[PDB]
Subunit: 50 residues, 2 copies
Amino acid sequence: IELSLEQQFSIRSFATQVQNMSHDQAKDFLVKLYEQMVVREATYQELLKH
Amino acid sequence: IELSLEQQFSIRSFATQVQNMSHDQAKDFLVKLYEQMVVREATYQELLKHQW
């Protein structure tokens, strides 16, 4: 639950780049990021269960 | 990557919701989602450590 300074820097920096995105770019990025998350969660769950 | 059928359904569900967002809604939700991904990652790292 406690984030590192580097994690916090990454989020704050991402947020500044999101503000330059068009409507179309933000939408395509959302769907791609959700897909990355769902795949990554499945990977972690497998590692944990093994 | 090759997605499972359940992943395909979840992502399509999410795509329907997104394609109906305004510019500002999509930007705001993107920053929230990225934060949630980082937090989840931190949580998983904690769970792995508490096995080994």
